[PDB]
From a paper:
Finding a correct substrate is especially difficult for the Escherichia coli Nudix hydrolase RppH, which triggers 5′-end-dependent RNA degradation by removing orthophosphate from the 5′-diphosphorylated transcripts. In Escherichia coli and probably many other bacteria, RppH converts diphosphorylated 5′ ends of transcripts into monophosphorylated ends that accelerate subsequent cleavage by the 5′-monophosphate-stimulated endonuclease RNase E. Escherichia coli RppH can also remove pyrophosphate from triphosphorylated RNA with lower efficiency. Here we show that RppH binds and slowly hydrolyzes NTPs, NDPs and (p)ppGpp, which each resemble the 5′-end of RNA. A series of X-ray crystal structures of RppH-nucleotide complexes, trapped in conformations either compatible or incompatible with hydrolysis, explain the low reaction rates of mononucleotides and suggest two distinct mechanisms for their hydrolysis.
GDP is too small for its terminal phosphate to reach even an extended catalytic site if its nucleobase binds to RppH in the same way as GTP. Instead, the structure of RppH bound to GDP and Mg2+, determined at 2.7 Å resolution, revealed that GDP slides toward the catalytic site by a distance that roughly corresponds to two phosphates of GTP. As a result, the 5′ α-phosphate of GDP occupies the position of the 5′ γ-phosphate of GTP and maintains two of the corresponding intermolecular contacts with RppH. The β-phosphate of GDP moves deeper into the active site, where it replaces Mg4. Therefore, the catalytic site in the GDP-bound structure contains three Mg2+ cations in a configuration remarkably similar to that observed in the RNA-bound structure. RppH likely catalyzes cleavage between the two phosphates of GDP by using a nucleophilic water molecule or hydroxide ion positioned between Mg2 and Mg3, as proposed for RNA substrates. In the crystal structure, this nucleophile is replaced by a fluoride ion located a short distance (3.2 Å) from the β-phosphorus atom, at a 157° angle compatible with in-line attack. In contrast to the second nucleobase of RNA, which inserts deeply into the protein cleft, insertion of the nucleobase of GDP is shallower and lacks some contacts formed by RppH-bound RNA. In particular, the GDP-Mg2+-F−-RppH structure shows the nucleobase of mononucleotide substrates emerging from the deep cleft and moving toward the catalytic site, causing it to lose some interactions with the protein but enabling the 5′-terminal phosphates to reach the catalytic site. With GDP bound in this manner, a nucleophile is well situated for in-line attack on the β-phosphorus atom.
Residue numbers in the entry:
A (entry chain A): 0 to 274
B (entry chain B): 0 to 159
Amino acid sequence: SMQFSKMHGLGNDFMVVDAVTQNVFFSPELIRRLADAHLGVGFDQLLVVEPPYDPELDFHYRIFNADGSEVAQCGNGARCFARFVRLKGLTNKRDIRVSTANGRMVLTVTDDDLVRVNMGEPNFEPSAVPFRANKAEKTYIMRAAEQTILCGVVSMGNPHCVIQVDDVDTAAVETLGPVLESHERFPERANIGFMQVVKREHIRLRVYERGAGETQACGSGACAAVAVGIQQGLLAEEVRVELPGGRLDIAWKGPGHPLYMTGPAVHVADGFIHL
Amino acid sequence: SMIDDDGYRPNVGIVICNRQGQVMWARRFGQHSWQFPQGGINPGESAEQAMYRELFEEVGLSRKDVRILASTRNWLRYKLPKRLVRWDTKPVCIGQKQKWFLLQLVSGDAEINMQTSSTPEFDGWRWVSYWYPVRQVVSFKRDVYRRVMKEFASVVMSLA
Ligand SMILES: Nc1nc2c(ncn2[C@@H]2O[C@H](COP(=O)(O)OP(=O)(O)O)[C@@H](O)[C@H]2O)c(=O)[nH]1
Ligand SMILES: [Cl-]
Ligand SMILES: [F-]
Ligand SMILES: [Mg+2]
Ligand SMILES: [Mg+2]
Ligand SMILES: [Mg+2]
């Protein structure tokens, strides 16, 4: 009887398995079986907590998809992992050092039991976004076909373009989104974000991602909108973000500082299953 | 001999943890592999007695250097690779039956010395994260190590 837990974070559903105190090998055949909702468990992505490879780190964890392949997307599942190792008594630390397929991070669990991630210092250099531009400005002007509009652009590893909208269900995201996603001045495209300022520390937003479109939660876009809304001067140190997938709390002191993002992870259920 | 009829030599294992929840990882003499200190029971001594002897023999720690935090209820067994069971030496040992002890180093790190022995078993040591040994132990010890670290984890986490 291999035990597991169902957890939910960033609008997506994780099956989480303690493979530290359990002897389980996840062959892609086994993963495919567990992905089946009737023969196995039923998950969108599988998160496996493993012993660390480096003696100075606490754990290593992997994420597999339903096809049985390893997924390597930065920061994915970090919130559920950090809460899981604490819930299962695998560790009592609040600053968890862990390696993934994309490197190593340090996760901090606040005492309200939500997970903080350091995602680096955002970069407004147009050569790094990339962005067809002469040099950086707090806003830019781009003519989306018959329509003019003004934006900030920033890189957080991935390109992001951000526009202020005066309400997010008042958004033509399905027509505007694709036009700026595939815009001439974005040689590697860009995640566009529609940002509705409610207060200097509260923001509703919807994201048309770089290649997928709108998803329940895109953490990259949440930090990007807040990163410029401060560089533009319209927001405070800390900002609450409200997306269709849930709420995120973002923090940044400005250039020369790293940006932190804090989010929830909810422990849905616990489970048995015989392999 | 002290090997039982099934072929298991009585043994004692040692998990030495510090104040930060790290554990001691010792390298075998003239080898690449690392492990926890373990030692064979001798005729007439109890498990705790054998633990304290092996602790000083290989780690150089005295009774006042450590404090016993926990120990496993009954014995844990592991079979040797049948490629390294010396069949010619009777009664031949096929495995080891160990009882494991979790100790907390109350002295400083300087009190560790692996040269107390004519015949040292370890030439190097370091602190490693608590779960690191479960991955990095040799494979035929891994199920014992997993069980031990699972049983001891609650104690170590409940400290600072
Ligand atoms: N080659 C090898 N032999 C092992 C290993 N672990 C246990 N041994 C076996 O167990 C013996 C080690 O003795 P040990 O359990 O440390 O107790 P002690 O000799 O009384 O201190 C070796 O002589 C082997 O028979 C290992 O990792 N590699
Ligand atoms: Cl002594
Ligand atoms: F010995
Ligand atoms: Mg020994
Ligand atoms: Mg010895
Ligand atoms: Mg001995």
